[PDB]
Every structure is written in C-alpha cells, then in structure tokens.
C-alpha cells in the first residue's frame, strides 16, 4: 500500500487501493475527485450495499458508512421505500 | 640523463609506474557517507 515508491510512481487504481486496507485518498488520487471518495471506499472490505436496490417503487440509492439512504419520489418514502 | 625525451631519435625508455608494480594499500577516508537526492530534493509529499 505504502512505500518509498508505492506512493511516488504514477497513481493507478490497478496498484495501490485494492489488496491491503485502502485507508484513504488512494481511491481519490487516481481520479482527482472528492465526489465518490466516501461513496465507494466503504466497498473495499465488506462488499457493496446498493447493488440490491433496496428502494422499490423507482427509488434511488445512496451509500453511507453503515446505513443506506433510499430516495423515493413525491408521495413515496420509506427506509427502503417501504 | 635518460629521463628527458627527444622526438627525432624516439628518445624514450619504457618505464613502469612504481606503485603499480608494488602496491602500498592503505584504505581510504570514509567517515562521511555520501548522499544523492531526488531532482526536486523532497521525494514524496501528501496533500493538505
Ligand atoms: Ca501495489
Ligand atoms: Ca490513488
Ligand atoms: Ca494510491
Ligand atoms: Ca498520495
């Protein structure tokens, strides 16, 4: 993950953030983008969480570090649009 | 004298260095380690 050269060479996602802990930034360095910085790094150890689409009734998903947000449309709500 | 040289007669006797044939080895002076550095000096950095 870290070394004298692991973080001195070119930043590639096919290198640093994959086979250790991927603590931080090494998922942001590759892209230079703090938008999905903490909406994807939660999916390094335990697997994805929105791939099941818990929200039904045409509701979008949002991943948080422990709980899932389900955006349901006007007049629709719920923990999973439930 | 034979030490000095003259061109037209090819005046030069073959000579061998003294220390080459007989070595007087004494080591060196190695009390300071020599360091090379990155072209920008400071190698790696983090974002702050
Ligand atoms: Ca690596
Ligand atoms: Ca990176
Ligand atoms: Ca990295
Ligand atoms: Ca870095």
From Swiss-Prot, chain A:
Outcome reported for the amino acid change (mutating residue 51 to K): In FA10D; Riyadh
Domain Gla: 1-45
Transmembrane segments: none
Impact upon substituting residue 14 to K: In FA10D; Vorarlberg; converts prothrombin at a normal rate but shows decreased affinity for calcium
Modification sites for (3R)-3-hydroxyaspartate: 63
Disulphide linkage map: 17-22, 50-61, 55-70, 72-81
Residues with the 4-carboxyglutamate modification: 6-7, 14, 16, 19-20, 25-26, 29, 32, 39
Mutagenesis / variant outcome for changing residue 14 to G: In FA10D; Ketchikan
Record-annotated EGF-like domain positions: 46-82
Record-given protein name: Factor X light chain
Organism this protein belongs to: Homo sapiens
Gene: F10
Covered residues, full protein: 41 to 122 of 488
């Amino acid at each position: 993950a870290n070394s004298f050269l692991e973080e001195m060479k070119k930043g590639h996602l096919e290198r640093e953030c994959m086979e250790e802990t991927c603590s931080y930034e090494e998922a942001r360095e590759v892209f230079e983008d703090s938008d999905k910085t903490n909406e994807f790094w939660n999916k390094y150890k335990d697997g994805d969480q929105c791939e099941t689409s818990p929200c039904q009734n045409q509701g979008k998903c949002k991943d948080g570090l422990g709980e899932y947000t389900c955006t349901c449309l006007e007049g629709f709500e719920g923990k999973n649009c439930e | 004298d034979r030490t000095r040289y003259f061109s037209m007669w090819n005046q030069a006797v073959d000579s061998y260095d003294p220390d080459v044939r007989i070595i007087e080895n004494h080591g060196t002076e190695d009390e300071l380690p020599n360091y090379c550095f990155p072209l920008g000096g400071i190698g790696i950095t983090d974002t702050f």
